[PDB]
């Protein structure tokens, strides 16, 4: 939510995108298509794996400790033993609750961020050749075949090649 892309200006996700987390859909003269973006997908996945690496398989060894169950009524010393354990458990329970809540807010925000960055990077690439339709889509003001679209997805798009064509289409009447 914090960047405003996922569940924001992007109306919804694409169930038909199964080979990546983020990507591109296009309509041009040659049809309508989809391709996943690997770098943004992997950027997100690496960060989540980072969090997992700190949390999975990291346990602490303990051996002889205090007794935690009792069959006799004893009073003072047993009170202290139970209290110490109950205290400990509440503090770790709190740690675990907060941890998950923060991690989850951060994961949601970083994934929104990755969507936003890809969008922004694509916008700059297009220079004066496209306009932002406000819903994650760019109107490209020039003939842009499959190789051209591919060139935008691959970071090899030369905006100067189409600038004349696009300015003419953009600033028409």
């Amino acid at each position: 939510g914090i960047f405003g892309a996922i569940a924001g200006f992007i109306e919804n996700g694409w169930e038909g995108m199964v080979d990546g987390w983020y990507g591109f859909r296009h309509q041009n003269s040659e049809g309508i298509g989809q391709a996943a973006d690997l770098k943004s997908t992997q950027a997100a996945i690496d960060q989540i794996n980072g969090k997992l690496n700190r949390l999975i398989g990291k346990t602490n060894e303990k051996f002889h400790q205090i007794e935690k169950e009792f069959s006799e009524v004893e009073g003072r010393i047993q009170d202290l033993e139970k209290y110490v354990e109950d205290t400990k458990i509440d503090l770790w329970s709190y740690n675990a609750e907060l941890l998950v809540a923060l991690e989850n807010q951060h994961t949601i925000d970083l994934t929104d961020s990755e969507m936003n960055k890809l969008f922004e990077k694509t916008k700059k690439q297009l220079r004066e050749n496209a306009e932002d339709m406000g819903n994650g889509c760019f109107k490209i003001y020039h003939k842009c075949d499959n190789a051209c679209i591919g060139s935008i997805r691959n970071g090899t798009y030369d905006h100067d090649v189409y600038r004349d064509e696009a300015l003419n289409n953009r600033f028409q009447i």
């Binding site: 992007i10 694409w14 983020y22 999975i56 990291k58 935690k68 458990i89 770790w92």
Partner: protein
């Protein structure tokens, strides 16, 4: 004519609900469980050295209740006490039973070295009918019940130095006779006393004439005590009657050993983390199986489940 290029992100038909700071229910594309909530139900015999107490408490294995004879000198990472266990030797109590149990459990060995105490002026090796070993009246294997010699009894004063590199643990006790039928039969006088001392310690204990409620049809009791004798130090026993004497000492060790109460069966499998419910995997950072654990375990928490998001917000199509 032109073209249209839309940026987007995936979504799944089956999202998972997680909690955040701002929202107790938000759907993400994927999550993983951080709380271990299941056990196979078996305590795995590896990689920790398990010693199943079976019918014997640690204390009964320590004292040497005949049915615990198989435990002599054994070591353990984890001694497992069973709820079906029972004592079947002379009735006894241990003031601070919990501390003796604890320090032995933590020492993690029953290694015992016999010692030759200068016992003259008394009959050693006293027995009873409530401690049957090998179909014959017997006693605790590590204790020596000291009685008269020819209906007489002088002042004992036996000494034993610790020239080893480890603490010695001495287990000993006091008899509390039933009546005057057992005051003039095994000790041969009116009164008694036991004083077990070191350079740094002194415990004295007064016996008691009196019938207790019967436990396996015996109304007398023994009271068990202990003494740690450090390197360079000496154990001294002044007795004028009633001594349940050590036959030697136990090695005290330091290490990772403990004891756990559980009725879970021991399985042939390998698991780092042991609870009373059985072993549990330790991939997760938390667990709600049991607050009692041994080994490399997830930390106990009150929650059943805690889902960590491993995917973006799910916004289906």
């Amino acid at each position: 004519p032109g073209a249209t290029l839309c940026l987007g992100h995936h979504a799944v038909p089956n999202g998972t609900i997680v909690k955040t700071i701002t929202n107790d229910q938000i759907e993400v594309t994927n999550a993983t469980e951080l709380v271990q909530s299941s056990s196979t139900g078996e305590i795995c015999d590896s990689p920790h050295q398990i010693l199943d107490g079976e019918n014997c408490t640690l204390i009964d294995a320590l004292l040497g209740d005949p049915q615990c004879d198989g435990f002599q000198n054994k070591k353990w990472d984890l001694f497992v006490e069973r709820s079906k266990a029972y004592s079947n030797c002379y009735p006894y109590d241990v003031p601070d039973y919990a501390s003796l149990r604890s320090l032995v459990a933590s020492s993690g060995t029953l290694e015992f070295n016999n010692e030759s105490f200068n016992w003259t002026g008394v009959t050693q090796n006293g027995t009873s009918s409530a401690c049957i070993r090998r179909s014959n009246n017997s006693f605790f294997s590590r204790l020596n019940w000291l009685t008269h010699l020819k209906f007489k009894y002088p002042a004992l004063n036996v000494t034993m130095p610790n020239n080893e590199k480890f603490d010695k643990l001495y287990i000993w006790g006091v008899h509390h006779p039933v009546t005057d039928n057992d005051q003039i039969f095994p000790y041969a006088q009116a009164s008694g006393r036991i004083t077990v001392s070191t350079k740094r310690s002194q415990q004295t204990v007064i016996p008691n004439i009196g019938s207790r409620p019967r436990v396996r049809n015996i109304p007398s009791r023994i009271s068990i005590y202990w003494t740690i004798v450090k390197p360079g130090d000496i154990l001294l026993i002044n007795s004028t009657g009633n001594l349940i004497a050590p036959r030697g000492y136990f090695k005290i060790r330091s290490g990772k050993s403990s004891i756990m109460r559980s009725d879970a069966p021991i399985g042939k499998c390998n698991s780092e983390c042991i609870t009373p419910n059985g072993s549990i995997p330790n991939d997760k950072p938390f667990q709600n199986v049991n607050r009692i654990t041994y080994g490399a375990c997830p930390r106990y928490v009150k929650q059943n489940t805690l889902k960590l998001a491993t995917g973006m917000r799910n916004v289906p199509e």
